[PDB]
RNA sequence: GGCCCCAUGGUGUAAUGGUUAGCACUCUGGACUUUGAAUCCAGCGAUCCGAGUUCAAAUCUCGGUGGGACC
């Protein structure tokens, strides 16, 4: 089923090969004879010996033949002897395969083979990974599907199969397996107690199963498993009895905390008595399980509010920030279940604390002072512009801060509302002229550094950084131009525009040279009166 | 005292690492070593030996995976123990005062304590000297020292040093062998047979012994004698492929006798390792190349084990004066490198190289090469020439992983066969071809028409040896990942049996085995007969 | 493109967190999560 | 209390305004189916900390840390 084009392609393929077709051979090799009906080939090498090989392609072809012809055991044996992946038997046709489980089992009919088949299940499909065609739910699903019918036909002499099948589930359900072992031990053809015991001991590496038995909340199971644990009964037996005597729910909490299952420990101890609740807190404050306990307790509980504030405080060490103080003013998921605590007051939690459950009004103007100082130090300068409106008439200081932050029209609003006209030109006019001058200084520095580093690069990265630094000031310059123009500084602003335009053209023309961000062409920084 | 200070650092490291283990935290040993050394004012790093020397057992159970030293000592798959015999005389000297023209100091050659072909400065030599050549003392000391490095001793094997062993009084060798077996059994005995029966049920699980010899002591009597000891492989010493050289070297025998010794031993079922001796007097370089090629081209020899030892002129021998007279000249080191590189390109795949170069101390040889390492130089040269070798030791999983860190991905079977000493040999293996990495092997043949053991008369095919490489896995342990208990051997046994039943057309399968290993075959329904495990084929 | 909502809602999430519907955060964050895999 | 001086591998040290901090003791690995230790080969170790400046900083500055002698 090939053609001249197909054959020539498979031959050359630009001397690129992949998959089952090719097969590495040795130096000086030759060809002696192919062996059909047995999928072999024999060849001679120069030193004077023979060699017999099984090439993949023939084997896989015959395997597909057999799978279509449904004699499962023949493919099984011919496929295990050659050390080939078993999962392919499912991978070839997962759908139809599942409809013939009992026939497959009758085809195999051997406990060791089924055990070996189980011990190598894997999720991934090698027909898409390892054996390309030349043309979670699955494992548990098939395991239970076959286990049901195989138990139905015989549980007695296939008990170990059931054991392995339940063991090799996605999650280890060791508890039910231990239950089956114990019930067989109680009971007197079928598999015996020590038989399955050894059949699982190597399989489980007992000590973990001993711990699991402790988790299973039954002493008798722990007894049998610990029989083989080699530990001194003088050690654990008094401890085990001590654990047995003490309280049921407290037993649960103590076993979970001994098994690190802190979620179950807290769940048990919550109902084990409110008196132990603070101690629980310590654990969920030591193990940071605040969020978990949030579900255990309910609103309108003092425990609930205490654990909420514990969550917001203890875990937020070095993080007395928006979440901490936020949910403090919230006391958890509740909107406003607490007040009278603010960490830094980032203009929101501060006023939320102050206004909600009003403690001190802005008559106690210390809040305004703190907010102004903090956020102005944070390069905001609008904090004061808002809070001082509620505070004393220090508007002039607000005007000063706006000028420092280049907020011109707000200073104009303050001067024309408070009638502070004397300061209309005393400071702002020279300040903005100096702003234009330092704009020139910075622009010249940018131009010089850009040219220097561009030439240094051209001798044989960071240029784009300076480039992006230059495009940020477009509308800043734009509005500063008109601000100056009210005082009729059109010449200085014209100088500003000319310098900005020259630098813009410099980087614009250098951009194709370098090549890499793209700037925006819809930034307005020019005025007709300026022009 | 600084010593207690390093002890405190050791304890600190111990508590840190056990704490990391409890929560399953992973930590670099060297990092904590450096930090602890600095914080305690140490001028030098701590030795790893002392680090292992203080772990408590309830932690040594699981800390060894991160603590073993020099893993290559088990990178093959089987532990190795070497023992030393008492110094004596070689037999040939019965004619004249000639041991061998190139042999080093013997019993009376200007050495206080020494042995034939041994200066006396090998670590094994000092161990024997302290032990006064006592078997039991030295073997206990050596196994204890090996276990100090946290290495499992589940499976062990013995190699015997010494000049000649077959040529010793019988009672002495019986005493020696029973002492060896009692060393592992721990049971005092009275004869060989009692020790054998007791070591059968021991737990050390000894798997065999190998001895050196020479073709003079190769008649079927000595082979039957060795059958009583469980020996598996043998050493001969070939030194050439040209008869004239033997009398030139005053060897005192014929290459023919070597050939019939090979044939007879292979018929019996032992393994054999040869010794090759490049750069000999009256031998050109082309002579060496031709003879080495012959060594595999001829169906006469086709041996199994190979060992090589370049010529080394040493004071005391006649060759010392011959070179001293300026009449025996060696090669330049480059010549030796090229010779070795060419040789390695010729080894058949089944043959396994065991060692290269001697271990003689440097300041004694009048022509000793500077390099204590030669295999590496040959590897560099064969990279330069872009031609690869196919030795077994260089394609097993252990060495390949430890030197290149390559994981097998697709392992399959491979079958080959040839002719040697009239035998129809056959070689089986599992290996991954794409990386040319090998995991398991088997050597099986048809017995010759002429035989010495009547138990093999008619319908009998002998399986000389079987082995899977890797590292030691305790017989109770099942899967530390790795590849030593996945049932691989079972497939090889059943397939070899099927081949012998059909292709060989035999009627009964026999096999040699180590004393403990017999129990293994009991699991397959094999029963004992004489010193041979056997199964009926019908 | 959507990067505007990358942090805006990621800081406007509080308007929902400050209420009782904290669970709804993830119930919308999924969309903000989705665009992470472009 | 200040003046000075110092801070490089685990330790002993070179080096210095620019693509790489070099040695030394030490430790680790292979040669090795005779060897932890030998012989060779190969490999893993680093500039007290924070601020500055400088295109660029271990070497330029300041601060801190700790240590060293001065009245
Ligand atoms: C003949 C002297 N030479 C030797 O022995 C070379 C060293 N031998 C070995 O390392 C191993 O025996 C082999 C080379 C055979 C690899 O073992 P292999 O993978 O083929 O064993 P399998 O996986 O097929 O079978 C496993 C069984 O072998 C058993 N086994 C392993 N070693 C031995 C031993 N010395 N003696 C008896 N049984 C053994 C195991 O206990 C295991 O039994 P299990 O059912 O409890 O697990
Ligand atoms: C062990 C193998 O090495 C050979 N042999 C022993 N001692 C020497 C030596 N000094 N030089 C060369 N070969 C030697 C033996 O003859 C035997 O073949
Ligand atoms: C140790 S030399 C090799 C073994 C033996 N002495 C022989 O020459 O036959
Ligand atoms: S037979 Fe071997 S051990 Fe004895 S003298 Fe000759 S070379 Fe040396």
């Amino acid at each position: 089923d090939a053609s001249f084009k197909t054959l020539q392609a498979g031959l050359s393929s630009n001397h690129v090969s992949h998959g089952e077709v090719l097969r590495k051979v040795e130096r000086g090799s030759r060809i002696v004879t192919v062996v059909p009906q047995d999928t072999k080939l024999v060849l001679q090498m120069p030193r004077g010996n023979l060699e017999v090989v099984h090439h993949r392609a023939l084997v896989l072809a015959q395997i597909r033949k057999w799978l279509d012809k449904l004699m499962f055991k023949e493919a099984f044996e011919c496929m295990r002897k050659l050390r080939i992946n078993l999962n392919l038997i499912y991978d070839h046709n997962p759908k139809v395969f599942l409809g013939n489980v009992e026939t497959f089992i009758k085809q195999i009919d051997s406990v060791n083979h089924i055990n070996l088949f189980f011990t190598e299940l894997k999720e991934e499909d090698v027909t898409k990974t390892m054996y390309p065609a030349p043309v979670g739910n699955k494992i548990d699903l098939v395991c239970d599907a076959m286990r049901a019918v195989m138990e139905s036909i015989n549980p007695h002499k296939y008990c170990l199969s059931i054991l392995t099948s339940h063991v090799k589930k996605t999650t280890p359900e060791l508890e039910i397996v231990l239950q089956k072992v114990h019930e067989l031990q109680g009971n007197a053809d079928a598999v015996s107690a020590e038989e399955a015991l050894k059949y699982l001991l190597h399989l489980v590496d007992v000590n973990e199963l001993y711990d699991h038995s402790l988790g299973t909340y039954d002493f008798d199971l722990v007894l049998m498993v610990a029989e083989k644990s080699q530990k001194d009964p003088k050690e654990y037996l008094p401890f085990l009895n001590t654990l047995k005597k003490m309280e049921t729910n407290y037993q649960r909490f103590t076993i979970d905390k001994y098994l690190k299952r802190y979620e179950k420990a807290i769940g048990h101890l919550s109902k084990c008595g409110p008196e132990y609740f603070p101690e629980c807190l310590n654990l969920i404050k030591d193990k940071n399980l605040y969020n978990e306990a949030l579900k255990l307790y309910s609103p309108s509980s003092q425990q609930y509010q205490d654990i909420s504030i514990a969550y917001g405080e203890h875990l937020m060490q070095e993080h007395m920030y928006e979440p901490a103080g936020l949910m403090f003013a919230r006391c958890g998921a509740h909107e406003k279940a607490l007040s009278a605590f603010l960490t830094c007051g980032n203009w929101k939690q501060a006023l939320c604390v102050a206004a909600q459950l009003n403690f001190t009004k802005d008559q106690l103007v210390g809040l305004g002072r703190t907010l102004a100082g903090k956020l102005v130090e944070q390069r905001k300068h609008i904090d004061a512009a808002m809070v001082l409106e509620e505070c004393a008439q220090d508007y002039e200081e607000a005007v000063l801060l706006l000028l420092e932050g280049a907020a011109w029209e707000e200073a104009l609003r303050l001067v024309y509302k408070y009638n502070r006209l004397d300061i209309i030109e005393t400071n702002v006019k020279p300040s903005i002229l100096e702003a234009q001058k330092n704009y020139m200084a910075f622009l010249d520095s940018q131009t010089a550094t850009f040219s220097r580093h561009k030439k240094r690069l051209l001798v044989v990265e960071a240029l784009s950084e300076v480039v992006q630094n230059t495009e940020n000031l477009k509308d800043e310059v734009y509005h500063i131009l008109k601000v100056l123009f009210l005082f009729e500084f059109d010449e200085q602003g014209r100088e500003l525009q000319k310098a900005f335009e020259d630098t813009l053209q410099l980087m614009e023309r250098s951009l194709p040279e370098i090549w890499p961000p793209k700037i925006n062409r819809r930034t307005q920084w020019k005025l007709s009166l300026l022009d | 005292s600084p010593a207690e200070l390093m002890m405190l650092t050791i304890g600190d490291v111990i508590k840190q690492l056990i704490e990391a283990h409890e929560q399953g935290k992973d930590i670099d040993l060297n990092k904590v070593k450096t930090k602890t050394a600095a914080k305690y004012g140490l001028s030098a790093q701590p030795r790893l030996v002392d680090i292992i020397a203080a772990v408590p057992p309830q932690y040594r159970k699981v800390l060894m995976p991160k603590l073993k030293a020099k893993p290559i000592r088990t990178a093959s798959g089987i532990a190795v123990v070497a023992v030393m015999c008492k110094p004596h005389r070689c037999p040939h000297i019965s004619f004249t005062g000639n041991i061998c023209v190139y042999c080093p100091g013997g019993p009376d050659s200007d050495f206080e304590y020494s042995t034939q072909s041994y200066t006396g400065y090998e670590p094994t030599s000092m161990r024997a000297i302290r032990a006064r050549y006592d078997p039991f003392l030295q073997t206990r000391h050596r196994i204890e020292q090996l276990k100090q490095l946290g290495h499992s001793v589940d499976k062990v094997e013995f190699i015997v040093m010494g000049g000649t062993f077959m040529a010793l009084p019988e009672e002495y060798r019986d005493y020696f062998i029973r002492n060896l077996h009692d060393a592992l059994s721990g049971h005092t005995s009275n004869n060989i047979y009692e020790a054998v029966k007791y070591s059968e049920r021991s737990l050390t699980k000894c798997i065999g012994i190998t001895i050196e010899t020479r073709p003079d002591y190769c008649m079927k009597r000595h082979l039957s004698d060795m059958l009583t000891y469980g020996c598996t492989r043998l050493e001969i010493g070939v030194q050439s492929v040209y008869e004239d050289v033997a009398r030139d070297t005053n060897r005192g025998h014929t290459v023919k006798a070597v050939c019939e010794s090979f044939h007879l031993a292979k018929d019996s079922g032992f393994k054999v390792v040869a010794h090759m001796m490049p750069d000999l007097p009256n031998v050109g370089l082309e002579r060496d190349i031709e003879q080495f090629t012959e060594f595999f081209e001829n169906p006469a020899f086709r041996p199994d084990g190979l060992k090589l030892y370049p010529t080394l002129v040493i004071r005391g021998t006649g060759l010392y004066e011959l070179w001293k007279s300026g009449r025996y000249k060696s090669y330049s080191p480059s010549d030796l490198v090229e010779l070795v590189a060419r040789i390695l390109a010729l080894v058949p795949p089944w043959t396994r190289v065991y060692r290269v170069q001697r271990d003689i101390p440097m300041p004694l040889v009048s022509s000793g090469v500077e390099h204590g390492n030669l295999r590496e130089l040959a590897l560099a040269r064969m990279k330069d020439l872009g031609i690869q070798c196919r030795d077994v030791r260089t394609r097993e999983v252990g060495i390949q992983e430890i030197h290149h860190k390559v994981r097998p991905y697709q392992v399959e079977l491979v079958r080959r066969d040839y002719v040697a000493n009239g035998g129809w040999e056959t070689f089986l293996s599992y290996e991954d071809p794409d990386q040319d990495i090998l995991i398991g092997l088997l050597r099986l043949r048809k017995c010759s028409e002429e035989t010495f053991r009547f138990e093999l008369g008619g319908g009998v095919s002998i399986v000389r040896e079987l082995h899977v490489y890797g590292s030691v896995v305790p017989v109770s342990s099942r899967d530390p990942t790795k590849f030593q208990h996945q049932g691989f051997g079972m497939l090889l046994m059943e397939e070899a049996e099927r081949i012998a039943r059909e292709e060989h057309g035999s009627g009964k399968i026999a096999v040699i085995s180590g004393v403990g290993t017999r129990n293994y075959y009991r699991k397959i329904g094999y029963r004992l007969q004489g010193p041979y495990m056997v199964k009926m084929l019908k």
Side-chain angles (χ1 to χ4, degrees), chain A residues 74-181:
Chain A
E74 298 71 354
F76 168 80
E77 51 208 358
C78 181
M79 201 284 268
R80 60 152 274 190
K81 61 179 75 196
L82 305 182
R83 189 62 66 183
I84 316 299
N85 183 1
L86 82 173
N87 209 332
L88 186 139
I89 191 164
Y90 186 58
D91 304 333
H92 166 46
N93 189 322
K95 300 292 178 68
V96 181
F97 170 78
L98 279 150
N100 313 114
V101 167
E102 59 174 24
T103 49
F104 167 74
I105 298 165
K106 291 172 294 221
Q107 200 74 33
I108 298 301
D109 276 351
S110 54
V111 54
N112 55 338
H113 293 198
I114 302 298
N115 190 0
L116 189 57
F117 157 76
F118 287 167
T119 188
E120 302 304 322
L121 269 297
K122 282 183 179 180
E123 281 291 336
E124 61 282 6
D125 191 325
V126 297
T127 65
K128 270 67 65 186
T129 302
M130 161 166 308
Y131 302 123
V135 180
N137 52 3
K138 48 177 285 293
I139 57 163
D140 294 331
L141 167 62
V142 303
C143 174
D144 313 324
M146 62 79 70
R147 187 176 47 221
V149 62
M150 182 277 288
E151 189 159 18
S152 78
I153 56 166
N154 185 6
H156 302 83
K157 304 153 195 282
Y158 304 136
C159 182
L160 305 190
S161 340
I162 316 289
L163 184 145
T164 277
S165 160
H166 273 112
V167 160
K168 288 322 191 167
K169 298 276 312 204
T170 291
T171 76
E173 315 95 328
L174 315 181
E175 62 286 9
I176 53 181
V177 183
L178 298 168
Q179 182 55 42
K180 316 309 192 305
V181 173

Side-chain angles (χ1 to χ4, degrees), chain B residues 77-78 154-155 205 207-208 465-468 475-478 483-490 512-514 516-517 519-521 523:
Chain B
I78 287 301
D154 196 75
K155 302 176 183 178
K205 196 70 66 67
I207 59 178
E465 195 267 357
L466 147 85
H467 183 74
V468 170
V475 65
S476 57
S477 55
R478 300 283 75 94
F483 297 134
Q484 218 181 35
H485 278 99
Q486 289 70 358
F488 271 86
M490 296 299 103
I512 188 177
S513 73
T517 64
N519 297 331
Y520 194 29
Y521 310 97
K523 310 154 176 60

